[PDB]
PDB file of C-alpha atoms and ligand atoms in Angstrom:
ATOM      1  CA  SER A   2       2.967 -10.526   9.645  1.00 27.28           C
ATOM      2  CA  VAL A   3       0.282 -10.761  12.354  1.00 28.41           C
ATOM      3  CA  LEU A   4      -1.694  -7.907  13.947  1.00 29.45           C
ATOM      4  CA  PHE A   5      -3.106  -7.621  17.477  1.00 29.28           C
ATOM      5  CA  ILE A   6      -5.718  -5.061  18.552  1.00 28.82           C
ATOM      6  CA  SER A   7      -8.173  -4.784  21.442  1.00 28.96           C
ATOM      7  CA  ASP A   8     -10.267  -2.319  23.396  1.00 28.31           C
ATOM      8  CA  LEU A   9     -11.831  -0.524  20.455  1.00 31.55           C
ATOM      9  CA  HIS A  10     -15.261  -0.336  22.174  1.00 32.84           C
ATOM     10  CA  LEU A  11     -16.932   0.190  18.807  1.00 36.64           C
ATOM     11  CA  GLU A  12     -20.315   1.867  18.898  1.00 38.37           C
ATOM     12  CA  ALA A  13     -22.582   3.810  16.562  1.00 40.83           C
ATOM     13  CA  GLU A  14     -21.960   7.104  18.379  1.00 40.69           C
ATOM     14  CA  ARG A  15     -18.155   6.966  17.950  1.00 35.64           C
ATOM     15  CA  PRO A  16     -17.812   7.156  14.152  1.00 37.19           C
ATOM     16  CA  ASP A  17     -14.280   8.521  14.589  1.00 37.87           C
ATOM     17  CA  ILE A  18     -13.191   5.177  16.040  1.00 37.01           C
ATOM     18  CA  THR A  19     -15.135   3.238  13.392  1.00 39.35           C
ATOM     19  CA  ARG A  20     -13.520   5.204  10.561  1.00 42.09           C
ATOM     20  CA  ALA A  21     -10.039   4.623  11.986  1.00 39.74           C
ATOM     21  CA  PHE A  22     -10.794   0.907  12.350  1.00 43.04           C
ATOM     22  CA  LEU A  23     -12.089   0.491   8.794  1.00 42.99           C
ATOM     23  CA  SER A  24      -9.096   2.347   7.419  1.00 41.01           C
ATOM     24  CA  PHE A  25      -6.861   0.087   9.507  1.00 38.16           C
ATOM     25  CA  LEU A  26      -8.604  -2.962   8.031  1.00 37.35           C
ATOM     26  CA  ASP A  27      -8.094  -1.765   4.451  1.00 34.33           C
ATOM     27  CA  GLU A  28      -4.532  -0.506   4.805  1.00 33.51           C
ATOM     28  CA  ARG A  29      -3.024  -3.101   7.124  1.00 33.62           C
ATOM     29  CA  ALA A  30      -5.233  -6.037   8.050  1.00 37.02           C
ATOM     30  CA  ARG A  31      -5.841  -6.978   4.408  1.00 35.34           C
ATOM     31  CA  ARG A  32      -2.100  -7.516   3.896  1.00 35.55           C
ATOM     32  CA  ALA A  33      -1.587  -9.382   7.198  1.00 36.91           C
ATOM     33  CA  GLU A  34      -1.518 -13.147   7.549  1.00 39.91           C
ATOM     34  CA  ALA A  35      -3.757 -12.916  10.637  1.00 39.31           C
ATOM     35  CA  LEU A  36      -5.599 -10.413  12.828  1.00 38.08           C
ATOM     36  CA  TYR A  37      -6.267 -11.098  16.511  1.00 35.63           C
ATOM     37  CA  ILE A  38      -8.870  -9.036  18.390  1.00 35.08           C
ATOM     38  CA  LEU A  39      -8.326  -9.553  22.108  1.00 37.12           C
ATOM     39  CA  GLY A  40     -11.610  -8.443  23.612  1.00 36.06           C
ATOM     40  CA  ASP A  41     -13.670  -5.281  24.100  1.00 32.66           C
ATOM     41  CA  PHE A  42     -14.120  -5.060  20.338  1.00 34.92           C
ATOM     42  CA  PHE A  43     -17.597  -3.599  20.839  1.00 37.45           C
ATOM     43  CA  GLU A  44     -18.727  -1.202  23.564  1.00 40.56           C
ATOM     44  CA  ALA A  45     -21.178  -3.886  24.741  1.00 45.37           C
ATOM     45  CA  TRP A  46     -22.844  -7.063  23.509  1.00 42.65           C
ATOM     46  CA  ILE A  47     -26.163  -8.491  24.687  1.00 44.85           C
ATOM     47  CA  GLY A  48     -26.068 -11.601  22.476  1.00 43.13           C
ATOM     48  CA  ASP A  49     -25.915 -12.287  18.761  1.00 43.37           C
ATOM     49  CA  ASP A  50     -29.713 -12.161  18.529  1.00 42.17           C
ATOM     50  CA  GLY A  51     -29.493  -8.490  19.547  1.00 39.13           C
ATOM     51  CA  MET A  52     -27.134  -7.302  16.809  1.00 38.80           C
ATOM     52  CA  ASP A  53     -28.034  -3.904  15.411  1.00 38.56           C
ATOM     53  CA  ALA A  54     -27.344  -2.458  11.970  1.00 40.48           C
ATOM     54  CA  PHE A  55     -24.082  -0.893  13.118  1.00 40.82           C
ATOM     55  CA  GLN A  56     -22.784  -4.150  14.561  1.00 41.25           C
ATOM     56  CA  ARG A  57     -23.816  -6.064  11.424  1.00 42.09           C
ATOM     57  CA  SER A  58     -21.894  -3.565   9.280  1.00 43.17           C
ATOM     58  CA  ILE A  59     -18.812  -4.222  11.381  1.00 41.94           C
ATOM     59  CA  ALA A  60     -19.267  -7.954  10.816  1.00 40.18           C
ATOM     60  CA  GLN A  61     -19.487  -7.329   7.081  1.00 40.81           C
ATOM     61  CA  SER A  62     -16.288  -5.269   7.187  1.00 42.50           C
ATOM     62  CA  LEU A  63     -14.434  -8.089   8.941  1.00 45.34           C
ATOM     63  CA  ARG A  64     -15.867 -10.590   6.458  1.00 48.43           C
ATOM     64  CA  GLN A  65     -14.364  -8.704   3.510  1.00 49.50           C
ATOM     65  CA  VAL A  66     -10.934  -9.033   5.105  1.00 45.72           C
ATOM     66  CA  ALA A  67     -11.441 -12.699   5.986  1.00 47.34           C
ATOM     67  CA  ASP A  68     -12.557 -13.476   2.428  1.00 46.71           C
ATOM     68  CA  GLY A  69      -9.317 -11.919   1.177  1.00 46.40           C
ATOM     69  CA  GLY A  70      -7.316 -14.618   2.988  1.00 42.91           C
ATOM     70  CA  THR A  71      -6.526 -12.914   6.290  1.00 41.89           C
ATOM     71  CA  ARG A  72      -7.312 -15.207   9.208  1.00 44.66           C
ATOM     72  CA  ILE A  73      -9.311 -13.302  11.852  1.00 46.18           C
ATOM     73  CA  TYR A  74      -9.515 -14.457  15.469  1.00 46.97           C
ATOM     74  CA  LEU A  75     -11.854 -12.803  17.961  1.00 44.91           C
ATOM     75  CA  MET A  76     -11.514 -13.245  21.720  1.00 45.92           C
ATOM     76  CA  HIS A  77     -14.074 -12.193  24.293  1.00 46.20           C
ATOM     77  CA  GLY A  78     -13.545  -9.219  26.535  1.00 47.01           C
ATOM     78  CA  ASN A  79     -15.600  -8.117  29.467  1.00 46.73           C
ATOM     79  CA  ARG A  80     -17.769  -5.893  27.252  1.00 45.29           C
ATOM     80  CA  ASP A  81     -18.471  -8.538  24.651  1.00 45.06           C
ATOM     81  CA  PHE A  82     -18.165 -12.047  26.176  1.00 45.03           C
ATOM     82  CA  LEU A  83     -21.621 -12.865  24.758  1.00 47.11           C
ATOM     83  CA  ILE A  84     -20.369 -12.840  21.141  1.00 48.82           C
ATOM     84  CA  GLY A  85     -21.273 -16.215  19.654  1.00 47.96           C
ATOM     85  CA  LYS A  86     -20.998 -18.437  16.610  1.00 46.95           C
ATOM     86  CA  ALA A  87     -23.638 -16.612  14.571  1.00 47.05           C
ATOM     87  CA  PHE A  88     -21.670 -13.364  14.713  1.00 47.06           C
ATOM     88  CA  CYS A  89     -18.401 -15.085  13.924  1.00 46.96           C
ATOM     89  CA  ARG A  90     -20.007 -16.919  10.963  1.00 50.82           C
ATOM     90  CA  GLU A  91     -21.209 -13.604   9.518  1.00 52.81           C
ATOM     91  CA  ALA A  92     -17.811 -11.989  10.222  1.00 52.44           C
ATOM     92  CA  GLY A  93     -15.771 -14.894   8.846  1.00 50.92           C
ATOM     93  CA  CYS A  94     -13.746 -15.046  12.062  1.00 50.30           C
ATOM     94  CA  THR A  95     -12.820 -17.756  14.566  1.00 52.70           C
ATOM     95  CA  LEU A  96     -13.790 -17.403  18.219  1.00 55.65           C
ATOM     96  CA  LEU A  97     -10.780 -17.992  20.454  1.00 53.82           C
ATOM     97  CA  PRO A  98     -11.325 -18.892  24.104  1.00 52.90           C
ATOM     98  CA  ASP A  99      -9.755 -16.808  26.813  1.00 54.20           C
ATOM     99  CA  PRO A 100      -7.099 -18.047  27.488  1.00 56.54           C
ATOM    100  CA  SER A 101      -5.564 -19.290  24.241  1.00 57.63           C
ATOM    101  CA  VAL A 102      -1.983 -20.306  23.442  1.00 57.17           C
ATOM    102  CA  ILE A 103      -1.062 -19.850  19.797  1.00 59.78           C
ATOM    103  CA  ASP A 104       2.043 -20.607  17.815  1.00 59.10           C
ATOM    104  CA  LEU A 105       3.582 -17.336  16.682  1.00 59.77           C
ATOM    105  CA  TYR A 106       6.622 -17.809  14.423  1.00 60.96           C
ATOM    106  CA  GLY A 107       7.524 -20.942  16.339  1.00 58.83           C
ATOM    107  CA  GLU A 108       6.969 -19.495  19.825  1.00 57.62           C
ATOM    108  CA  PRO A 109       4.024 -20.406  22.091  1.00 57.37           C
ATOM    109  CA  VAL A 110       2.264 -17.162  22.980  1.00 56.80           C
ATOM    110  CA  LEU A 111      -0.485 -16.714  25.558  1.00 59.46           C
ATOM    111  CA  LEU A 112      -3.442 -14.467  24.621  1.00 58.76           C
ATOM    112  CA  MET A 113      -6.031 -13.082  27.056  1.00 60.66           C
ATOM    113  CA  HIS A 114      -8.273 -10.075  27.307  1.00 61.69           C
ATOM    114  CA  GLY A 115      -6.514  -9.288  30.590  1.00 61.22           C
ATOM    115  CA  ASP A 116      -9.333  -8.728  33.057  1.00 60.83           C
ATOM    116  CA  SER A 117      -8.935 -12.205  34.553  1.00 58.26           C
ATOM    117  CA  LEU A 118      -5.505 -11.041  35.826  1.00 55.28           C
ATOM    118  CA  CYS A 119      -7.015  -8.197  37.881  1.00 55.79           C
ATOM    119  CA  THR A 120      -7.311 -10.385  40.944  1.00 56.30           C
ATOM    120  CA  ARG A 121      -6.829  -7.596  43.509  1.00 60.03           C
ATOM    121  CA  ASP A 122     -10.221  -6.147  42.504  1.00 59.73           C
ATOM    122  CA  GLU A 123     -12.423  -8.434  44.564  1.00 61.65           C
ATOM    123  CA  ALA A 124     -15.655  -6.692  43.564  1.00 62.98           C
ATOM    124  CA  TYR A 125     -14.875  -7.230  39.893  1.00 63.75           C
ATOM    125  CA  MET A 126     -13.681 -10.800  40.482  1.00 65.74           C
ATOM    126  CA  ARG A 127     -17.052 -11.523  42.104  1.00 67.98           C
ATOM    127  CA  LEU A 128     -18.956  -9.898  39.241  1.00 67.82           C
ATOM    128  CA  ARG A 129     -16.976 -11.812  36.630  1.00 68.89           C
ATOM    129  CA  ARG A 130     -17.576 -15.131  38.372  1.00 61.62           C
ATOM    130  CA  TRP A 131     -21.315 -14.423  38.389  1.00 64.19           C
ATOM    131  CA  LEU A 132     -21.501 -13.095  34.809  1.00 63.37           C
ATOM    132  CA  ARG A 133     -19.749 -16.132  33.349  1.00 65.93           C
ATOM    133  CA  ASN A 134     -21.621 -18.708  35.447  1.00 65.99           C
ATOM    134  CA  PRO A 135     -23.560 -20.962  33.025  1.00 67.08           C
ATOM    135  CA  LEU A 136     -26.683 -20.389  35.113  1.00 70.35           C
ATOM    136  CA  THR A 137     -26.346 -16.618  34.685  1.00 67.69           C
ATOM    137  CA  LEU A 138     -25.796 -16.965  30.955  1.00 69.30           C
ATOM    138  CA  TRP A 139     -28.911 -19.181  30.872  1.00 70.20           C
ATOM    139  CA  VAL A 140     -31.216 -16.665  32.526  1.00 69.04           C
ATOM    140  CA  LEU A 141     -29.711 -13.706  30.617  1.00 69.41           C
ATOM    141  CA  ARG A 142     -30.502 -15.121  27.201  1.00 67.10           C
ATOM    142  CA  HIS A 143     -34.114 -15.604  28.332  1.00 65.93           C
ATOM    143  CA  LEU A 144     -34.440 -11.847  28.866  1.00 64.53           C
ATOM    144  CA  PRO A 145     -36.170  -9.867  26.110  1.00 65.44           C
ATOM    145  CA  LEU A 146     -33.738  -7.794  24.061  1.00 67.29           C
ATOM    146  CA  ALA A 147     -34.913  -4.474  25.522  1.00 66.25           C
ATOM    147  CA  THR A 148     -34.475  -5.791  29.057  1.00 64.64           C
ATOM    148  CA  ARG A 149     -30.979  -7.037  28.269  1.00 68.47           C
ATOM    149  CA  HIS A 150     -30.101  -3.563  27.031  1.00 67.53           C
ATOM    150  CA  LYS A 151     -31.468  -2.173  30.312  1.00 68.25           C
ATOM    151  CA  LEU A 152     -29.293  -4.476  32.390  1.00 67.20           C
ATOM    152  CA  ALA A 153     -26.252  -3.750  30.238  1.00 72.05           C
ATOM    153  CA  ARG A 154     -26.819  -0.019  30.803  1.00 72.22           C
ATOM    154  CA  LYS A 155     -27.045  -0.645  34.562  1.00 68.76           C
ATOM    155  CA  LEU A 156     -23.785  -2.613  34.592  1.00 67.29           C
ATOM    156  CA  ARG A 157     -22.063   0.129  32.581  1.00 71.33           C
ATOM    157  CA  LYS A 158     -23.362   2.785  35.019  1.00 70.83           C
ATOM    158  CA  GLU A 159     -22.196   0.966  38.116  1.00 72.93           C
ATOM    159  CA  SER A 160     -18.883   0.080  36.459  1.00 68.72           C
ATOM    160  CA  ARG A 161     -18.258   3.704  35.539  1.00 68.88           C
ATOM    161  CA  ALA A 162     -19.047   4.847  39.087  1.00 67.25           C
ATOM    162  CA  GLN A 163     -17.050   2.130  40.829  1.00 70.54           C
ATOM    163  CA  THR A 164     -14.021   2.208  38.526  1.00 70.54           C
ATOM    164  CA  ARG A 165     -13.535   5.938  39.126  1.00 73.00           C
ATOM    165  CA  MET A 166     -13.225   5.226  42.860  1.00 73.83           C
ATOM    166  CA  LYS A 167     -10.610   2.429  42.560  1.00 71.54           C
ATOM    167  CA  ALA A 168      -6.852   2.871  42.856  1.00 72.67           C
ATOM    168  CA  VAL A 169      -4.728   2.288  39.759  1.00 71.80           C
ATOM    169  CA  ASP A 170      -3.114  -0.781  41.258  1.00 71.60           C
ATOM    170  CA  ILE A 171      -6.545  -2.298  41.919  1.00 70.61           C
ATOM    171  CA  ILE A 172      -7.625  -2.029  38.308  1.00 69.80           C
ATOM    172  CA  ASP A 173      -4.313  -3.101  36.727  1.00 69.19           C
ATOM    173  CA  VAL A 174      -3.081  -6.684  36.604  1.00 67.25           C
ATOM    174  CA  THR A 175      -1.881  -8.303  39.773  1.00 71.70           C
ATOM    175  CA  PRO A 176       1.906  -8.488  39.323  1.00 71.41           C
ATOM    176  CA  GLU A 177       2.328 -11.999  40.724  1.00 71.55           C
ATOM    177  CA  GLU A 178      -0.521 -13.373  38.597  1.00 72.71           C
ATOM    178  CA  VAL A 179       1.485 -12.725  35.417  1.00 74.94           C
ATOM    179  CA  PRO A 180       4.339 -15.214  36.021  1.00 77.53           C
ATOM    180  CA  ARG A 181       1.886 -17.669  37.564  1.00 76.88           C
ATOM    181  CA  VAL A 182      -0.428 -17.808  34.553  1.00 79.64           C
ATOM    182  CA  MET A 183       2.427 -17.630  32.027  1.00 77.09           C
ATOM    183  CA  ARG A 184       4.286 -20.474  33.710  1.00 75.13           C
ATOM    184  CA  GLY A 185       1.098 -22.546  33.827  1.00 76.64           C
ATOM    185  CA  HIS A 186       0.708 -22.187  30.065  1.00 79.20           C
ATOM    186  CA  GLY A 187       4.429 -22.688  29.447  1.00 78.82           C
ATOM    187  CA  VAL A 188       4.959 -19.397  27.594  1.00 77.60           C
ATOM    188  CA  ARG A 189       7.525 -16.611  27.735  1.00 78.99           C
ATOM    189  CA  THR A 190       5.251 -14.107  25.960  1.00 75.04           C
ATOM    190  CA  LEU A 191       1.793 -12.919  26.949  1.00 75.73           C
ATOM    191  CA  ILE A 192      -0.315 -10.432  24.948  1.00 74.03           C
ATOM    192  CA  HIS A 193      -3.410  -8.890  26.504  1.00 71.08           C
ATOM    193  CA  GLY A 194      -5.524  -5.772  26.587  1.00 68.91           C
ATOM    194  CA  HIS A 195      -8.194  -4.641  29.091  1.00 71.76           C
ATOM    195  CA  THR A 196      -6.033  -2.295  31.187  1.00 69.78           C
ATOM    196  CA  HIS A 197      -5.766   0.460  28.521  1.00 68.47           C
ATOM    197  CA  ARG A 198      -2.084   0.936  29.443  1.00 68.43           C
ATOM    198  CA  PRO A 199      -0.139   0.094  26.286  1.00 68.77           C
ATOM    199  CA  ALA A 200       3.345  -1.089  27.171  1.00 68.10           C
ATOM    200  CA  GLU A 201       5.786  -3.974  27.003  1.00 67.31           C
ATOM    201  CA  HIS A 202       6.784  -5.314  30.430  1.00 68.01           C
ATOM    202  CA  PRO A 203       9.866  -7.504  30.778  1.00 66.65           C
ATOM    203  CA  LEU A 204       9.831  -9.976  33.638  1.00 67.48           C
ATOM    204  CA  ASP A 205      11.520 -13.064  35.023  1.00 67.35           C
ATOM    205  CA  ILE A 206       9.868 -16.486  35.138  1.00 67.00           C
ATOM    206  CA  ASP A 207      11.932 -19.208  36.793  1.00 65.54           C
ATOM    207  CA  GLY A 208      15.176 -17.421  36.031  1.00 63.63           C
ATOM    208  CA  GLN A 209      14.307 -16.876  32.348  1.00 65.93           C
ATOM    209  CA  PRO A 210      13.412 -13.566  30.640  1.00 62.49           C
ATOM    210  CA  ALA A 211       9.800 -13.171  29.542  1.00 63.20           C
ATOM    211  CA  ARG A 212       7.563 -10.358  28.273  1.00 62.31           C
ATOM    212  CA  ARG A 213       3.993  -9.113  28.623  1.00 61.89           C
ATOM    213  CA  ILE A 214       2.691  -6.869  25.844  1.00 63.37           C
ATOM    214  CA  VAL A 215      -0.374  -4.728  26.649  1.00 60.34           C
ATOM    215  CA  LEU A 216      -2.484  -3.427  23.752  1.00 61.13           C
ATOM    216  CA  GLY A 217      -3.779   0.153  23.636  1.00 65.25           C
ATOM    217  CA  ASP A 218      -7.391   1.286  23.692  1.00 65.93           C
ATOM    218  CA  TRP A 219      -8.826   3.372  20.866  1.00 64.81           C
ATOM    219  CA  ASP A 220     -10.579   6.194  22.724  1.00 62.62           C
ATOM    220  CA  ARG A 221      -8.114   8.890  21.598  1.00 63.03           C
ATOM    221  CA  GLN A 222      -6.026   7.168  18.925  1.00 61.70           C
ATOM    222  CA  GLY A 223      -5.848   3.795  17.272  1.00 61.32           C
ATOM    223  CA  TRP A 224      -3.340   1.130  18.229  1.00 63.23           C
ATOM    224  CA  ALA A 225      -1.850  -1.963  16.646  1.00 60.27           C
ATOM    225  CA  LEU A 226       0.817  -4.481  17.602  1.00 59.60           C
ATOM    226  CA  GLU A 227       2.462  -6.024  14.528  1.00 59.63           C
ATOM    227  CA  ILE A 228       4.686  -9.095  14.741  1.00 56.26           C
ATOM    228  CA  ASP A 229       6.637 -10.832  12.005  1.00 55.66           C
ATOM    229  CA  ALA A 230       9.425 -13.417  12.110  1.00 56.73           C
ATOM    230  CA  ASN A 231      12.068 -10.695  12.650  1.00 56.09           C
ATOM    231  CA  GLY A 232      10.550  -8.457  15.332  1.00 56.08           C
ATOM    232  CA  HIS A 233       7.534  -6.567  16.529  1.00 56.58           C
ATOM    233  CA  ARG A 234       6.252  -3.062  17.123  1.00 56.04           C
ATOM    234  CA  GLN A 235       3.233  -1.537  18.797  1.00 57.07           C
ATOM    235  CA  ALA A 236       2.508   2.019  17.713  1.00 55.56           C
ATOM    236  CA  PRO A 237      -0.464   4.379  17.739  1.00 57.68           C
ATOM    237  CA  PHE A 238      -2.001   6.207  14.795  1.00 59.91           C
ATOM    238  CA  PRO A 239      -4.525   9.060  14.744  1.00 59.90           C
ATOM    239  CA  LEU A 240      -8.249   8.444  14.655  1.00 61.00           C
TER     240      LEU A 240
HETATM  241  C1  LP5 B 301     -27.416 -10.171  28.731  1.00 60.93           C
HETATM  242  C2  LP5 B 301     -27.159  -8.729  28.387  1.00 60.93           C
HETATM  243  C3  LP5 B 301     -27.182  -7.803  29.595  1.00 60.93           C
HETATM  244  C4  LP5 B 301     -26.200  -8.216  30.666  1.00 60.93           C
HETATM  245  C5  LP5 B 301     -24.823  -8.494  30.114  1.00 60.93           C
HETATM  246  C6  LP5 B 301     -24.249  -7.337  29.289  1.00 60.93           C
HETATM  247  C7  LP5 B 301     -22.741  -7.492  29.197  1.00 60.93           C
HETATM  248  C8  LP5 B 301     -22.022  -6.219  28.762  1.00 60.93           C
HETATM  249  C9  LP5 B 301     -21.957  -5.113  29.839  1.00 60.93           C
HETATM  250  C10 LP5 B 301     -20.524  -4.720  30.204  1.00 60.93           C
HETATM  251  C11 LP5 B 301     -20.359  -4.084  31.594  1.00 60.93           C
HETATM  252  C12 LP5 B 301     -18.883  -4.032  32.019  1.00 60.93           C
HETATM  253  O1  LP5 B 301     -18.387  -2.724  31.781  1.00 60.93           O
HETATM  254  C13 LP5 B 301     -18.708  -4.297  33.520  1.00 60.93           C
HETATM  255  C14 LP5 B 301     -17.248  -4.611  33.834  1.00 60.93           C
HETATM  256  O2  LP5 B 301     -16.720  -5.656  33.530  1.00 60.93           O
HETATM  257  N1  LP5 B 301     -16.610  -3.660  34.500  1.00 60.93           N
HETATM  258  C15 LP5 B 301     -15.204  -3.766  34.902  1.00 60.93           C
HETATM  259  C16 LP5 B 301     -14.249  -3.376  33.772  1.00 60.93           C
HETATM  260  O3  LP5 B 301     -14.529  -2.071  33.294  1.00 60.93           O
HETATM  261  P1  LP5 B 301     -14.521  -1.880  31.660  1.00 60.93           P
HETATM  262  O4  LP5 B 301     -14.741  -0.390  31.564  1.00 60.93           O
HETATM  263  O5  LP5 B 301     -15.677  -2.728  31.188  1.00 60.93           O
HETATM  264  O6  LP5 B 301     -13.210  -2.389  31.144  1.00 60.93           O
HETATM  265  O7  LP5 B 301     -12.904  -3.381  34.221  1.00 60.93           O
HETATM  266  C17 LP5 B 301     -12.676  -2.487  35.306  1.00 60.93           C
HETATM  267  C18 LP5 B 301     -11.175  -2.504  35.609  1.00 60.93           C
HETATM  268  O8  LP5 B 301     -10.688  -3.862  35.732  1.00 60.93           O
HETATM  269  C19 LP5 B 301     -13.521  -2.886  36.492  1.00 60.93           C
HETATM  270  O9  LP5 B 301     -13.339  -1.916  37.544  1.00 60.93           O
HETATM  271  C20 LP5 B 301     -14.981  -2.911  36.120  1.00 60.93           C
HETATM  272  O10 LP5 B 301     -15.676  -3.605  37.129  1.00 60.93           O
HETATM  273  C21 LP5 B 301     -16.498  -2.879  38.035  1.00 60.93           C
HETATM  274  O11 LP5 B 301     -16.408  -1.660  38.106  1.00 60.93           O
HETATM  275  C22 LP5 B 301     -17.438  -3.730  38.832  1.00 60.93           C
HETATM  276  C23 LP5 B 301     -17.833  -3.100  40.150  1.00 60.93           C
HETATM  277  O12 LP5 B 301     -16.659  -3.124  40.997  1.00 60.93           O
HETATM  278  C24 LP5 B 301     -18.977  -3.887  40.814  1.00 60.93           C
HETATM  279  C25 LP5 B 301     -20.283  -3.644  40.082  1.00 60.93           C
HETATM  280  C26 LP5 B 301     -21.481  -4.451  40.586  1.00 60.93           C
HETATM  281  C27 LP5 B 301     -22.693  -3.972  39.778  1.00 60.93           C
HETATM  282  C28 LP5 B 301     -23.989  -4.690  40.077  1.00 60.93           C
HETATM  283  C29 LP5 B 301     -25.117  -4.046  39.278  1.00 60.93           C
HETATM  284  C30 LP5 B 301     -26.485  -4.701  39.419  1.00 60.93           C
HETATM  285  C31 LP5 B 301     -26.912  -4.721  40.874  1.00 60.93           C
HETATM  286  C32 LP5 B 301     -28.426  -4.830  40.980  1.00 60.93           C
HETATM  287  C33 LP5 B 301     -28.867  -5.437  42.311  1.00 60.93           C
HETATM  288  C34 LP5 B 301     -30.232  -4.937  42.687  1.00 60.93           C
HETATM  289 MN1   MN B 302     -11.616  -1.954  27.367  1.00 63.49          MN
HETATM  290 MN1   MN B 303     -11.903  -4.847  29.287  1.00 64.27          MN
END
């Protein structure tokens, strides 16, 4: 089987989430063929050169699972799009670009964090375009570590303020973007996170049934989607 998780937002001051995650690694990821982490794995990331002791311990926990034979794939989210090759080397995982199409039991499956689908949120679309601009990435990595933390705190503050003011349909995926992006990648299945609204959505693409599976966030309970050749199930479990 294969496991999909996202939106853990791991941080030193949420040991309840960390403990649930490590137990999940021991009890389920170790026995899986592969684990996919579809963004927002950490609460924030300023660059691999800024990794703290907590984040290094998480890398070491992933590495134990990777060394056991489980293939681990990590995709950026909007909290942690600065994760790089040094982290993945320590963690024994493979960095997957957003978007990525994988082969899952013979089916092409599209994987994304999900925030790129939130095209009705023009303020966020503008921020994302700036944050991912190579010129922005260039100047950001020239900031001292402490100053990067400052700017990350400022982005979190403004995001918390602004997101509270937005309507639900502004922060969720744009409905018409789903068939558009899925058709472009030639898939009938899309798995993403970001929206913190775990669900499976059936839809039509060109007169054919398709599905969009949304992974749950870990603020109140853990979540995992498990797929094998015979079926799939996403279910929560207590922290
Ligand atoms: C190099 C290291 C330091 C710098 C890089 C650090 C990178 C890590 C920081 C992560 C911040 C991230 O939370 C911002 C973000 O993505 N917010 C959108 C997202 O909310 P999440 O809660 O993150 O899922 O998803 C929400 C739902 O889709 C969406 O609503 C949020 O987006 C916003 O709220 C954005 C606001 O609409 C616009 C904010 C503009 C802020 C500008 C601040 C600086 C201005 C200073 C000018 C003087
Ligand atoms: Mn998230
Ligand atoms: Mn997100």
